[PDB]
Amino acid sequence: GIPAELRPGTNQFLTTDDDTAAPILPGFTPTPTIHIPGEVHSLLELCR
Amino acid sequence: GIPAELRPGTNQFLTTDDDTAAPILPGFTPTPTIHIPGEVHSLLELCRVETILEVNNTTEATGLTRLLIPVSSQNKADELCAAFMVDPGRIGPWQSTLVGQICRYYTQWSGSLKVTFMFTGSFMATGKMLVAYSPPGSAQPANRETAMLGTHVIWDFGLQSSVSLVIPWISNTHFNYDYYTAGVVTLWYQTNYVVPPETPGEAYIIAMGAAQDNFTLKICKDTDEVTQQAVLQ
Amino acid sequence: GIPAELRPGTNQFLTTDDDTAAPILPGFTPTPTIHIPGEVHSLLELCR
Amino acid sequence: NGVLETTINHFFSRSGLVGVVNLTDGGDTTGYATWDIDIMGFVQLRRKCEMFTYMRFNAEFTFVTTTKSGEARPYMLQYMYVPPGAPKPTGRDAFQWQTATNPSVFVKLTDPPAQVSVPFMSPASAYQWFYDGYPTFGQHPETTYGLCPNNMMGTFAVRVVSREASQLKLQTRVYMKLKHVRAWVPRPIRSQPYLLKNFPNYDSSKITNSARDRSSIKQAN
Amino acid sequence: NGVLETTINHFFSRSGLVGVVNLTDGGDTTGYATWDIDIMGFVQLRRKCEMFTYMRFNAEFTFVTTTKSGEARPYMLQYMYVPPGAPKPTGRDAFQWQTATNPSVFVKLTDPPAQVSVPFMSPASAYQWFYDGYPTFGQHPETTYGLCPNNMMGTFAVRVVSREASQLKLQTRVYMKLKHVRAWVPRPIRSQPYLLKNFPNYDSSKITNSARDRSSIKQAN
Amino acid sequence: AANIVLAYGEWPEYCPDPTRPDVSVNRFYTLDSKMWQENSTGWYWKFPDVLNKTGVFGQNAQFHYLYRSGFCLHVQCNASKFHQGALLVAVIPEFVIAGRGSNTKPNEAPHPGFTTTFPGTTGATFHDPYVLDSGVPLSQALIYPHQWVNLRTNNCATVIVPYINAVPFDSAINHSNFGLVVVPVSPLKYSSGATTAIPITITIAPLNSEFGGLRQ
Amino acid sequence: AANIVLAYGEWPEYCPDPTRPDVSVNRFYTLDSKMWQENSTGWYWKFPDVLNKTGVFGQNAQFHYLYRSGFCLHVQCNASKFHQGALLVAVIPEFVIAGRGSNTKPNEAPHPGFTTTFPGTTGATFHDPYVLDSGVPLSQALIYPHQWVNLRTNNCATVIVPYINAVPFDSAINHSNFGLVVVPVSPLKYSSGATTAIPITITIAPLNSEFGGLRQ
């Protein structure tokens, strides 16, 4: 197969990392989102 | 999934390797960089600066006087004033310069060097020196006459307050019995030092040197220049 | 991440194999080659 | 002839050892170990980054951990990185370790080393190892001269993950690689030995000469 | 009919065993082991690269390490490569091992072997195994004949990473593959056996004939 | 005026689009001259200090919380044709003197006093100039922006330095951006009967200045 | 002149854009002829040596630190039609003789003496030519640039060799680029009454020479 080599940082759990975790329920489609007024994007909007 | 096979070199940490390490703070954006003047890209930019050699280093003048080589009235013409080997990488006068200290971090160098002299005597004083370079393999020139036959510059103080001499080529090579033979540069009295009355009869030459454009270094290593080993605390 | 599966022949050192070994000195550039006469490409050149 | 070995970035490459920290479990008093990030620690890398004034870079740390006898065993470790300004763990069991904003890497002792990168953390546009002045604005009436808080890069702390104490003993060699290095306004490189860790202070009586002496000025070896 | 097996590069391929080094821990006097890189070591590969004069190539080393009984255990090892011109480690605990410019590979004993590549390190444009002359320029007044420092390829050193000494005993088979091989100005291949390692010297009294004899010239087997 | 040294090949500029004192701060300030003699060991001036307590420039800096500017420095040495010597005029950023007289501990390490760190208008004097009191090799001081003033040749040295720092603005009282070091590399020599002590005059023009955060 | 051997099919050239002695070094040098007889075992000349102490070429090489050139070699053998034999004229790069008389240790191993390694103008003589004193099989010496000079046929052998080395320039005194080996493969035979000893004359023209680093 494709030759690969493992590098340091293998088998480590970094709390701040980012990557796709396998969905526990792949075929589940969640309730579609409606329009709820007053959505907050940034905290700066909330500081002013 | 994608079939894979592990190869030797797996699970090894190679200090000199290169690869992306996972950012501990992915969403952090650092302070944008402004313009700070005097940025340094290569160390060669930093070698070409000409800095003072210590040509008088021996157990007599200890201090700032260690940077200065003298001339006087009592010295007859046609005799040697001072001499020093030209290599950046060994002990002696070049350890004070950048090019000398920067060559401690690299095993092999080669290129052309630039040696420059400056005269601090009085505006009224006058004389001449013969500054000559003997290529490697030739020994210490014994006489001014044989020194003249090589690569030299007659340098008259009254005319020029500074002279410059480009040594053509110099580099290290291996493969203390080798003792790395390299060239030497000597500085001779062409004529005795002439001075008018009511003027000091003793002056100093100050010598400084730097690399030129084609000077290159390679094969990095750490310096023996410091034995300190982790002050800390 | 990318789903993968290890196959037999993993973690083996085959003397005759071929693959990139990590350079111990990545930033080192070797002395450029000059022209040296009498280069030998094949041993057959040397049999004749 | 390739210039690439003399560039300012290659000169700081090649991860070296910036510190070592020891860990022993009595379980309560000290069950942990902490190491402040300081690149002034040893004298090789100190003397290199003191030939410049302002430097801006990234750090990449690799944690090599073994046991006292040296043979591993599958114990799990936690490497917490407390960014500058956060409180440091005061105990093995302290609540500091569950703080979400302190990133961590859980890695077993039998694995290859753990590796992370740190960004450029200063509020200033670059680090400066030479600061002439005082940190305080409060009209210092007048030992605080030269020390600027801006260079704090954070801290690592290490523990063993377990409910009870495990009697093993560890030390962690921490290798740091230095990436994307920009450097400004160079200095001369130090002749004299170092005395105090964080300060330029040197010895006035013992001053060593920059160039080894010889017999006479006009005799060349 | 495919020429590719006779090319000069395929003839030097196929990593073989270029040396073996033993390691034992008393912890202090010798806790380490060092091996200079020499491809003249054994007689198979020596006789091949002595049929040429100038050769230029890369090296690829693979370190197979086992224990005396042969069964592994997860101890960590350090392979330091000191490039030509650097000082060699004088002790297990010596400061040589923390030098940043000496690359290293930390790998556990239970892993697959560690593998690295070396570039072409000579200042000259190619290696030369036959040098007629003297290394010194100092007018040799006249055992130093034939030995050129240019062929120094560096050195490896091996230690076990630990704070205390571990009583295990190891030996390291080191296999070397030879890549991107160019070769020039061929020689004849040696008839006589080798006596001294680094020198052509042979035995004048015992000279062996190149072709095994037979009964009579005019009788063909 | 024959040769100006332009530090780091870059000219002073204003804030890269914080106020400007028009042309009001533009004029020469002439410091008290230093008297150089056979045994003189050198001098230095922490620069955004020297002008702190003197002049219209001084009132702004003490009453404003942030500060930015470059400078133009002129160093003249008046002396006859019978005097001889050489000086090294260098502008070295973030010049930090050091405690000498080694006692190495966390506690009793002899840090410099404020009068030794910030000298004021009268500048200070090197104990041992060979290390520049930095522990660093003076023979390498030629890295920085520098000029040789050699009595044999021209007696003037001028250097323009831009504002350099990791931040755009900084306090004028606490932080000293660059120091100005003047050392007598080759000692002064004169024949008997000549005037014994040679004066050194340094004139500084705070060109391209900015201030902010006034304090009533 | 019937056939020239052009070593490795490549002509001498100058430095691939270090000085040139115009045409001044271009001329034939004729070595002392060697006297070949029934029992003669062969000869060799370390080449950038033979000319080192003799001639205008010799003064340049001893007084210059670096050296580069190729050569043109002519080997003539004068002899009657009643003499017979054959010689093998070969130019073998980096010819390194070897210590014979085996004692194998780190210490007492009998390395060759300087007079044996660099023979000088008069060349040297093989102890046992069968191995070429290299330990290598002479029967394979035909690899190198070579010519047969066979008294039955033409008596001249000419070979042009280019400068070969891993570096562009090298010292003339210390390093001997190539040796010139002349061996009597088939022994000389002559009838009674004929002249007993046959001379061998080698003429060498240092074409395309360069020097550098003169020493006063």
Short mmCIF file of C-alpha atoms in Angstrom, two decimals, chain D residues 53-54 124-126 128 130-134 136-137 139 142-143 145 185-192 195-196 199-204 207-210, chain F residues 8 46 93-102 104-105 109 111 114 117-118 128 130-131 133-137 140 143-144 165-167 173-176:
data_model
loop_
_atom_site.label_atom_id
_atom_site.label_comp_id
_atom_site.label_asym_id
_atom_site.label_seq_id
_atom_site.Cartn_x
_atom_site.Cartn_y
_atom_site.Cartn_z
CA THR D 53 18.04 43.13 19.40
CA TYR D 54 14.52 42.43 18.13
CA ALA D 124 4.83 44.07 21.04
CA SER D 125 5.71 43.52 17.41
CA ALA D 126 8.86 41.54 18.29
CA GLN D 128 13.55 42.33 22.64
CA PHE D 130 17.89 44.16 25.51
CA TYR D 131 15.63 46.71 27.20
CA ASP D 132 17.12 49.95 28.50
CA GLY D 133 14.77 51.43 31.03
CA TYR D 134 12.24 50.59 33.71
CA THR D 136 7.08 50.96 35.78
CA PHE D 137 5.33 54.18 34.77
CA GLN D 139 7.64 57.52 38.72
CA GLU D 142 15.09 55.29 43.03
CA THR D 143 17.25 45.60 40.43
CA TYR D 145 16.33 47.73 35.50
CA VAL D 185 19.39 45.57 14.28
CA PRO D 186 22.27 43.24 15.16
CA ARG D 187 24.66 43.51 18.08
CA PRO D 188 28.20 42.35 18.75
CA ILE D 189 28.53 38.90 20.26
CA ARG D 190 29.64 38.60 23.85
CA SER D 191 33.29 38.14 24.79
CA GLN D 192 32.90 37.83 28.53
CA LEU D 195 27.33 35.38 35.67
CA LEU D 196 23.70 36.10 36.45
CA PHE D 199 21.24 40.12 33.39
CA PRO D 200 24.27 41.31 31.40
CA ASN D 201 26.41 41.65 34.57
CA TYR D 202 30.01 40.52 34.13
CA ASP D 203 33.22 40.36 36.17
CA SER D 204 35.29 43.53 36.10
CA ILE D 207 38.23 40.39 32.30
CA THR D 208 39.43 37.98 29.65
CA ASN D 209 41.06 39.24 26.48
CA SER D 210 39.23 38.66 23.22
CA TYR F 8 20.49 51.63 8.85
CA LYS F 46 21.23 57.75 27.02
CA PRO F 93 20.35 50.88 20.14
CA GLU F 94 19.07 49.80 23.54
CA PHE F 95 22.43 50.40 25.16
CA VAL F 96 22.31 48.68 28.54
CA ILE F 97 25.19 49.10 30.94
CA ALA F 98 25.94 46.27 33.33
CA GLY F 99 26.87 45.61 36.91
CA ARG F 100 30.59 44.98 37.18
CA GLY F 101 32.56 43.92 40.23
CA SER F 102 31.23 40.39 40.12
CA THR F 104 27.04 36.22 41.44
CA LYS F 105 23.89 35.44 43.45
CA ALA F 109 24.46 41.11 42.47
CA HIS F 111 23.07 46.28 39.72
CA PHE F 114 19.93 55.15 38.41
CA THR F 117 22.08 54.04 34.13
CA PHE F 118 20.49 57.34 33.11
CA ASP F 128 36.54 50.09 31.50
CA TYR F 130 37.29 47.85 26.39
CA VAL F 131 34.00 45.99 26.96
CA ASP F 133 30.61 48.30 30.03
CA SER F 134 28.26 45.87 28.27
CA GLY F 135 30.58 42.89 28.57
CA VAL F 136 30.60 43.01 24.75
CA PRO F 137 33.77 43.44 22.57
CA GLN F 140 33.11 44.91 17.20
CA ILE F 143 28.59 47.07 13.62
CA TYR F 144 26.39 49.88 14.79
CA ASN F 165 11.61 50.16 18.58
CA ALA F 166 9.29 47.18 18.66
CA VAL F 167 6.31 49.48 19.30
CA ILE F 173 11.11 59.15 30.78
CA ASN F 174 11.36 55.42 31.45
CA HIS F 175 12.69 53.92 28.22
CA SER F 176 15.91 55.08 26.56
#
